[PDB]
């Protein structure tokens, strides 16, 4: 290795969820679901 | 009539005898030198060679020749044999 690997799990999208993960820190919540449709997604104004 | 004195432009350096020593078609012995020069203008070929100062010296007894590798430079060789 020599650096932390790629432990996946869930990145807690704020909306509902996305799995995806790897990166580093597993159980990462993120506030805006960000894709997930929270704004600019299918247009919404 | 009393004027000024001096400049800065009389220095020079003394000669270095820069030349081709033996020429093409000259019998040369062993060790002789063939090219005293600045850099790699003529490059060492068959049975030639150089140390330090780009000095083409015959490794072995023979005849000296020139061939022109256009691109690859100018090459002084040695035809040992006879």
């Amino acid at each position: 290795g020599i650096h932390p690997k790629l432990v996946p799990a869930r990145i807690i999208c704020g909306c509902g969820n996305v799995i995806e993960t790897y990166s580093t820190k597993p159980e990462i919540y993120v506030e805006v679901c960000s894709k997930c449709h929270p704004f600019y997604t299918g247009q919404q104004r | 009539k009393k004027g000024l004195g001096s400049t800065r432009n009389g220095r020079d350096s003394q000669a270095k005898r820069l030349g081709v020593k033996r020429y093409e078609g000259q019998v040369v012995r062993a060790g002789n030198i063939l090219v005293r020069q600045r850099g790699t203008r003529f490059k060492p070929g068959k049975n030639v060679g150089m140390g330090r100062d780009f000095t083409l010296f015959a490794l072995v007894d023979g005849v000296v020749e020139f061939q022109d590798r256009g691109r690859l430079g100018r090459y002084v060789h040695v035809r040992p044999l006879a």
Partner: protein
């Protein structure tokens, strides 16, 4: 490991819709993605010591792999660049490592951008090298706050197998690259 979201969404969708629009003869003509490169326009923290290196222990959180420092040659004295041995943090990432960041680019590291209209539709160099600029960095989800200090922006280039100026612009349009039209 070898299978991920936009990983699938690449082959399983993006390539085809690219060909019915345009029209490709061979297979190795589709704009697939070859390399993603990251460059830190630093120069600042060059001065002191307590901070300059910490611009690296984090850029392994966005790609799993540690980054790389680089320097210069020319002698510009306009700011303490004597002779030439300064700062230049960069990183490059391929395979899955080039995918997760993408999977984390247009999905979590997006909404929290000041005046987020999308992405630049004018910043095109013809050959598939669209460019942007990342001022803030907390938009990366891992880049929190509880272990940071201040601003450390950077800009990232993108490399394609594309041909035309309009080409990759379309490739972008299906991976998640909104513009302003």
């Amino acid at each position: 490991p070898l299978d991920l979201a936009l990983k699938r969404k690449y082959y399983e969708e993006v390539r085809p819709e690219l060909i019915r629009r345009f029209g490709y003869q061979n297979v190795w003509e589709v704009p697939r993605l070859e390399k993603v490169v990251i460059n830190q326009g630093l120069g600042e923290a060059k001065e002191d010591a307590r901070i300059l290196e910490k611009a690296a222990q984090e850029l392994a959180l966005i790609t799993g792999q540690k980054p790389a420092v680089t320097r210069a040659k020319k002698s510009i004295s306009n700011f303490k660049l004597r002779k030439g041995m300064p700062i230049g943090l960069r990183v490059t990432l391929r395979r899955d490592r080039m995918w997760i960041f993408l999977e984390k680019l247009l999905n979590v590291a997006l909404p929290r951008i000041r005046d987020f209209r999308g992405l630049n539709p004018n910043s095109f160099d013809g050959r598939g090298n669209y460019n942007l600029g990342l001022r803030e960095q907390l938009i990366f989800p891992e880049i929190t706050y509880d272990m940071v200090d201040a601003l450390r922006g950077m800009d990232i280039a993108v490399v394609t197998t594309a041909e035309t100026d309009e080409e990759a612009r379309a490739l972008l349009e299906l991976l998640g690259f909104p513009f302003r039209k």
